[PDB]
Amino acid sequence: MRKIIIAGNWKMHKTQAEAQAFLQGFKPLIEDAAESREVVLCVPFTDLSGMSQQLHGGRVRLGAQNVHWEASGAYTGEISAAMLTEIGIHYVVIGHSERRQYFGETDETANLRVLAAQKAGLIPILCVGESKAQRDAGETEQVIVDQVKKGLVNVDQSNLVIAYEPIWAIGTGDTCAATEANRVIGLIREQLTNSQVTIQYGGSVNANNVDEIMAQPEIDGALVGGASLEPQSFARIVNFQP
Amino acid sequence: MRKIIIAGNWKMHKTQAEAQAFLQGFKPLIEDAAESREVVLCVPFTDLSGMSQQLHGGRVRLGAQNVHWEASGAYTGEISAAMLTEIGIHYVVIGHSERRQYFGETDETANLRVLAAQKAGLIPILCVGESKAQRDAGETEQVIVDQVKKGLVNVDQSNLVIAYEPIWAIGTGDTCAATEANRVIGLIREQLTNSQVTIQYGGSVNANNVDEIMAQPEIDGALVGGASLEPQSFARIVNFQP
Ligand code: NA
Ligand code: NA
């Protein structure tokens, strides 16, 4: 059985004080979620250490939202794997569409970041997804296959999460049809050498479509943006039925 | 007199443990430094909170190495001004050439980040600098004029530091001649409405050229990369002599 992973991508939200208030409201709500479900909060760099303290010994895992591909060096503004493992966090989001759109991320640098994360013992969540223009031009399959191939060069597929996030579904409320997400995620799984990789859907997941999305046989989890920002919403997604 | 500011840009170096060890060796060496000299360490996001607790009541100020231009939002991996001011830090490096080279920074986004830092009460250090290609083409002056103009739209020039870092001098050991840094920095100062702005030189500053660089009439400080990584080196740069 593949691992179920419900991950919240806070993006650029929440001071440490706001993160603490979230956790005050969130921890009681997921106490009885099935123990086998992995719950991850992927939070700003400046929230990691404080939240690490508040979560130690509990079930909730922390993720960073980026990591650089070198161990150290002349990359002003970047955070290294060693900085993250010192805090003891478990996950890192890599290759998110917003870093490809705005901040120069390529398939090649995404791959290198994944490798750096793995060698440090972090669990990478590699994000892939086609644009509206690519989808409209009929290019989804080719784009996704190429992002997966380039993203996974030399990557250990026993320590890997993939999130399919069609770019047009991110933050728009235009959730991808669950059967179409299943279709593309099935195509991703076909490219893999380890078919047991957890593959998530992301893109306007909310408490009212999580059940339907998780009901798809190829889909093993969700990377949740806006609906992960408040406790009750994210808890209902963690507590998806059945 | 303009404010003298000696800033260390650690770039992607130092875990919290390594940052703590640096401060142990560094604090004794600048205890008696001239009180008029502002000493700044610009450190990775994950070191800011821990170092801040070790620095209360001291003279050493902290800077971050980036900040985003929006207060919050869908910018996975980015840190907002509110996240930094919560920690209480004083400075932020903006528009460093490494962000422009690798991570999609433009003059326009550097400007917007400067505005965000200022509105939060952070002191921005805006980095400008020409490439080797632009330098060899005789385009330094036009390039710098353009970066300063675009970088400073709507910017409060009473809360502003500029670092001139010719790109070919960064991390190479090819330090720009002091009188040439002085010449270009004079041209920068001519473009400002507030002539009292602190303008730093950056690019292979070390303990053996800091005296000559600081003696130039237009140069008010230094943004120091590799030579800020260990305490004895950086202290001698803080303790520059006539
Ligand atoms: Na499923
Ligand atoms: Na001077």
Residue numbers in the entry:
A (entry chain A), B (entry chain B): 1 to 242
From the paper:
Triosephosphate isomerase (TPI) interconverts glyceraldehyde-3-phosphate (G3P) and dihydroxyacetone phosphate (DHAP) near diffusion rate-limiting during glycolysis and the Calvin-Benson cycle. In most organisms, TPI is an obligated dimer that folds into a (β-α)8 barrel known as the TIM barrel. Thus, in land plants the ancestral cyanobacterial TPI originally present in chloroplasts was replaced by a duplicated version of the cytosolic TPI. Herein we found that Synechocystis TPI (SyTPI) is highly resistant to oxidative agents, suggesting that TPIs from prokaryotic photosynthetic organisms evolved to cope with ROS at the expense of redox regulation.
In order to have a structural understanding for the insensibility of SyTPI to H2O2 and thiol-conjugating agents, we growth protein crystals of SyTPI in complex with 2-phosphoglycolate (2-PG) that diffracted at a resolution of 1.6 Å. Resolution of the crystallographic data revealed that SyTPI assembles as a homodimer and that each monomer folds into a canonical (β-α)8 or TIM-barrel composed of eight α-helices and eight parallel β-strands. The active site of SyTPI shows that the catalytic residues Lys 11, His96, and Glu165 are poised in close contact with the inhibitor 2-PG. A superimposition of the crystal structure of SyTPI with TPIs crystalized in the absence of ligand (AtcTPI and AtpdTPI) illustrates that SyTPI exhibits a closed loop 6 conformation. SyTPI harbors a deletion of 7 amino acids in the loop that connects α-helix 6 with β-strand 7. In AtcTPI and AtpdTPI this region folds as a short α-helix, whereas this region in SyTPI folds as a loop that connects α-helix 6 and β-strand 7. SyTPI contains three cysteines per monomer. The thiol group of residue SyTPI-C127 is completely buried, whereas the thiol group of SyTPI-C176 contains the only accessible thiol group in this protein. A ribbon representation centered at residue SyTPI-C176, shows that this amino acid directly interacts with residues Y201 and S203 from the conserved loop 6 (phosphate-binding loop). An electrostatic map near residue SyTPI-C176 shows that this residue is surrounded by amino acids that have a negative electrostatic potential (D174, E212, E180) limiting the potential of this residue to react with GSSG or with H2O2.
